Design a binder for this molecule. Structure first.
Ligand code: APC
Ligand code: APC
Ligand code: APC
Ligand code: MN
Ligand code: MN
Ligand code: MN
Lengths: 288, 288, 288
């Protein structure tokens, strides 16, 4: 919805946004929103996401699709009305994104997802990009478990010429919906083939916001499918624009830079990662 | 589906993926998946592939088309539900790719298809590419024979101005689907007219993963029509990204370089091939 | 169809392909496929070709258009199934190209269509290109006459601002279909207005293979319509690609080079032609 501010209320917002990344307990936003999703009375649409055609499919809290949902509306604080209707497995009325309130006045945050190696990491969308054979796949997985911490991370696989990878975009949005409904730390390998369809355009535009709203982190390998030229900036500015955080390889072996948006209008942070390979191409991020 | 990992189960996956290439018996994954396909219940749709329009046609285990199929849903381990329905010869519900699970938890592999001249070769898609008219046709044939070994290889012909060559994309994808259903080693000559329709974009995106999942190898001649300029990266990298392996001509006559993706996040291997022509342009790949 | 090979059967294939060009009596493949066409039942579709919209029109063995044809299916040796149906003048089911099997196991040939001046010429598509008033029109007619030998050659006219030229693409494909069904040596003047519609894109992909399968030669004048700055590189390379043979002008007046693909995987031959004009711009190819 829209929000109104004066100097005082705006100072409060910013303080609250600063706190959401800097001082709230890591993973707390996800547990909260998990609570909100659990208390949703079953059958209620919770999430809508674009398929390849530009239409949207709709999910309930248990990540099952909704085929049929008759018009229901809700009135917000700002006087606006949200409506949801699902017909023949497609959204007839509504919008893309979360269809129940996970934030609730607190908007423009990058909720802290995890802490590792003396650094806090934001929820939202993390794009891992860089020079060909940068070691992107090993890096998303290392980031996956590191930020998972005590929890397992979910791996969504897409569009690579390896065994068991889905290459159908609609199954892909279904995997991603399920991941974000059920898990705090999610890896996508990869976005190569998404980079276009309306679904693909919707996805890039929608996912960071959906993830941030949830307080989960989606760690997505990108990669320009052509050129080791200065195309390492087009997708890396499509990266810069649609990502909460950016992880880029450097000229130094095994070294990466992490750039994080810490919230709305707040300062962007930078830190470095050192990494090395063990057996079977398992990568470790160095910490202590 | 999506898969959940912690450090320990990930290390087991990488061990398992490494083995699928490096220590499994060659052609063993193909025999296994032949066994899975054999054991499906009669009439079960097994494979869907995009036709020119972007719709999908569906095949059973004996590479015969299915034209009508009442909606059947199956619930995967990750809570995902897969649905398949076919009407008037066209998929009405489902996805492109394999419609039964060939892989399970074991995904992200490049299962060894064959061993020849002291080197292991991956299943999936191998694109053969190079300068102008570089001897691609003779090489895809020698490589088919060689990887076939005890078995005959299947030849799918498409889009060249020579006798008996199909030029209809929809007959092409029917040929490809049957080839992958029934044979471990498949040669495609050529992909030049594919490089786009919706079906053509789908084929390029799907075929490597379909082949890798089956344990079969598709050896495809490419070719840009025009330019020896830096279109020798435009069709390429469109190759190094859609392909499990690349075979590229060098500046030395008869010499080729093989670049192999051995698995998800695993090391890319390189080796060289020396070749010579015998009678009637039959190419031999040197070994010992 | 798809075809299976081992070393020995591939060796046989290449020998048969080599003989189809080098040792068969010239024009014998044309006479062979004529016999196959004469054997098909009355009313049966033999050939489908793309019209402007990308729909296909269908012809019978006597080059008459089929408007209605009840669904009939046919199962080839490889297990593949062809379904042909015509309805309201347009292919409801089937594929572009030959609808009956003209070639069998003998595929990937460039069947000798004629001999003239001590050179064998291939059936298929011969694109005549170069320069800009190199004398393309006189050359296609001289080549038509010479390859015709004892037979008259057929002239298909299209898209030139001269008396009696068809400029309608659907009449063009009707002319080309009839020509290939009835004559071994066909001249097309010219392809400038086809170089895009779906039909126009279908033609360039289809006709080399259609002609080679029949054992007829289509001698097509191409011509760039605009530019002369490395556009002669583009069309000479986009020609090299959809053509069985290329005839190219040189920097020497009246002189042309002929580049011939002699079959699948086989050696490409080159020879030169010297020519001169007599009365009324009638061109003679010098021989002996
Ligand atoms: N033991 C090891 N030592 C050094 N590098 C290794 C390694 N194991 C894997 N790698 C590197 O890690 C990469 C990970 O696999 P891939 O997914 O194939 C490439 P990527 O960097 O993710 O980019 P791309 O797939 O987007 O092109 C390999 O290409 C390889 O360069
Ligand atoms: N005995 C021999 N010695 C040397 N070269 C030979 C040969 N027999 C065949 N070739 C070459 O091998 C090629 C046969 O395959 P072709 O289909 O004609 C070209 P290609 O490299 O596959 O790419 P293209 O078809 O995309 O142009 C020809 O270029 C031919 O010159
Ligand atoms: N007596 C003569 N002496 C020399 N050249 C002659 C000639 N009579 C005709 N020509 C050549 O043949 C051409 C006639 O064919 P046109 O169709 O007019 C051009 P083209 O070379 O076929 O290419 P275009 O039609 O694709 O532009 C003339 O432009 C000229 O180059
Ligand atoms: Mn990768
Ligand atoms: Mn070739
Ligand atoms: Mn002309």
């Amino acid at each position: 919805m829209i929000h109104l501010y004066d100097a005082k209320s705006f100072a409060k917002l910013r303080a609250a946004q600063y706190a959401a990344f800097h001082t709230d307990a890591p993973g707390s936003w996800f547990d909260h929103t998990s609570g909100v999703l659990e208390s949703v009375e079953d059958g209620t649409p919770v999430l809508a996401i674009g398929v390849e055609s530009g239409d949207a499919i709709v999910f309930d809290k248990n990540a099952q699709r909704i085929v049929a949902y008759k018009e229901k509306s809700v009135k917000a604080e700002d006087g606006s009305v949200s409506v949801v209707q699902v017909e023949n497995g497609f959204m007839k009325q509504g919008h893309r994104g979360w269809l129940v309130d996970l934030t609730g006045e607190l908007v423009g945050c990058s909720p802290v997802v995890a802490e590792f190696g003396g650094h806090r990491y934001a929820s939202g969308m993390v794009i891992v990009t860089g020079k060909g054979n940068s070691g992107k796949t090993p890096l998303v997985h290392a980031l996956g478990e590191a930020l998972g911490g005590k929890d397992k991370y979910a791996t969504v696989r897409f569009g690579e010429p390896l065994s068991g990878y889905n290459t159908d975009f609609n199954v892909f949005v279904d995997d991603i919906a399920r991941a974000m409904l059920q898990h705090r730390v999610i890896v996508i390998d990869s976005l190569k083939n998404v980079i276009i369809s309306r679904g693909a355009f919707d996805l890039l535009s929608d996912i960071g916001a959906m993830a941030a709203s949830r307080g989960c982190v989606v760690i997505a390998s990108l990669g320009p499918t052509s050129n080791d030229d200065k195309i390492v900036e087009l997708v890396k500015e499509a990266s810069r624009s649609n990502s909460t955080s950016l992880v880029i390889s450097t000229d130094v072996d095994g070294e990466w830079q992490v750039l994080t948006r810490t919230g709305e209008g707040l300062q962007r942070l930078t830190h470095t990662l050192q990494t090395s390979y063990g057996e079977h191409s398992v990568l470790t991020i160095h910490t202590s």
